[PDB]
Design a protein around this ligand. Structure first.
Ligand SMILES: COc1ccc2c(c1)cc(CNC(=O)c1cc3ccccc3o1)n2CC(=O)O
Ligand SMILES: COc1ccc2c(c1)cc(CNC(=O)c1cc3ccccc3o1)n2CC(=O)O
Lengths: 276, 288
């Protein structure tokens, strides 16, 4: 019942859930507002944008979890976080996260069966289960996700509302390459022809977002034409929904989402759309 | 913060109100105890409340909510006893300071959407014929725990499979609460307390003593091993007028995927007319 060592203003690494839970609770008692940034593999600028967002809350202490599925290299990742002034990295093993194996889990609502839930019908159960655990271990005031995985973000908001969780969910605008391609660990697999064609996803969506003054059908036809101008872009879906991913209403706010396969690589993108 | 009057019973229906009060209290040093109930309070519930009040510095929150999601049927949901007036009167007499009495709309404003899927235990025993019953229980318990954020949550051992699943929920989702299991309160003859005992007619009430008789006979027979324990309990249930046994199972204490060693739980469920009764007891095998 002694609190684990915490050195303020340094990067403190913990692998044990109980240690990070004790430190986060001790920190919340001393004033600090605990921010959580969940991550998975090699850190990229997308991830750094979540960190920076969390850093700007006055009195924040930022916790970055690094944990691979059951849903890169440790050296550089940790160097990057130190550089960002992150004070806690949580790096648990699979065994420490799942000491009893897979047992009680979260069952998403029917949204999880749609869109990405078509090829990966249990994917979102995994993500929601591990999010719930990280939220209970760290007990942050705010948790930060990219808007890139939009359906994921919406399901997370559903989790927080449905299970009455305390935490504020912050969606952070997707970081993009110079030509608009949304950042993703998958981008590096693309060969040159594929990387050149992949700019069609973001170009389609931004075209649709500007075509939308002319109504929903013009937005969708614009995105579709841009996708049709690209070779080797196999479109899995292109759907305009309302902001919670229900059916898009006659006018007002929506989201347009696309997924496509370029060779063996699946890419996704989405954008805010205002109808008329 | 709504009003909170200490040494009185404060009743809140809105989850935001009880959440605000509970947080406010924990931050002034009071430890928050939660006793979840479905109302129709009996002495077994008052044992939970007493256990909670005995924790130094406690404030006791008792929830009363008949959770539609854990009911199947049928007319089971509409049939559950509701005695709101006797319930709050009991809580005032026990010196409880908070009752949380949410509406169905406040708990399920989006209907059934994200839910808890229990592990494989939920498909065994009570769950075999009621495959979504324990997903409903665990989903509600998770919500009540997030709304109230108690330090310690109290459950009877009578619904032992439920208590085991609740400890699984707490371990598997890293919940910060301690689960306290309180031994079943029984009538003078041994009959386990239950909201459903009111549906036994005089003859069924007489015959219902066989469940606890059979279990206590087994716990003592158990020096002679598992088969003798099981056969003692079966003999007693067989001797009982109009008791229809649904199962009698001797399991390891976790009810889980491990064999019985020295410590077991013997569980029984039986029908007296239309009334399903459950009971269970600790069993030590042999030299235990
Ligand atoms: C703000 O700009 C952007 C742009 C693209 C982004 C991100 C941010 C963040 C991500 C990837 N998501 C995670 O690492 C992640 C989510 C998650 C959920 C639960 C547990 C661990 C988790 O880890 N990507 C896309 C990607 O890398 O493919
Ligand atoms: C300490 O001695 C005993 C003996 C028998 C007991 C009890 C105590 C308590 C109960 C009934 N349980 C609830 O009302 C209840 C509500 C609830 C709500 C959410 C999660 C779990 C929940 O459990 N029974 C048995 C019964 O009444 O059939």
């Amino acid at each position: 019942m002694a609190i684990p060592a915490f050195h303020p203003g340094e990067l403190n690494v913990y692998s044990a859930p109980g240690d990070v839970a004790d430190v986060s609770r001790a920190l919340r008692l001393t004033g600090r507002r605990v921010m959580l940034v969940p991550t998975m593999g090699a850190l990229h600028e997308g991830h750094l944008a979540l960190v920076r967002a969390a850093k700007r809350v006055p009195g924040s202490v930022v916790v970055v979890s690094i944990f691979v599925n059951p849903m890169r290299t440790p050296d550089d990742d940790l160097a990057q976080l130190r550089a960002e002034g992150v004070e806690i990295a949580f790096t648990p093993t699979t065994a420490a996260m799942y000491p009893d194996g897979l047992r009680t889990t979260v069952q998403p609502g029917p949204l999880a069966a749609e869109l990405e839930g078509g090829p990966r019908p249990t994917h979102f159960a995994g993500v929601l289960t591990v999010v719930l655990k990280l939220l209970q271990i760290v007990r942050p005031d705010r948790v930060f996700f990219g808007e890139k995985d939009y359906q994921q973000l919406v399901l997370i908001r559903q989790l927080v509302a449905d299970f009455n969780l305390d935490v504020a969910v912050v969606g952070v605008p997707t970081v993009r390459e110079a030509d608009g391609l949304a950042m993703s660990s998958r981008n590096r697999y693309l060969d040159p022809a594929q990387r050149a064609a992949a700019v069609a996803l973001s170009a389609a969506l931004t075209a649709a977002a500007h075509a939308a003054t002319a109504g929903a059908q013009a937005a969708l036809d614009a995105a579709r034409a841009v996708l049709d101008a690209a070779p080797g872009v196999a479109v899995d879906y292109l759907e305009l929904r309302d902001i919670g991913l229900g059916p898009m209403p006659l006018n007002g706010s929506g989201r347009l989402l696309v997924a496509a396969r370029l060779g063996t690589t699946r890419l996704l993108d989405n954008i805010a759309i205002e109808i008329g």
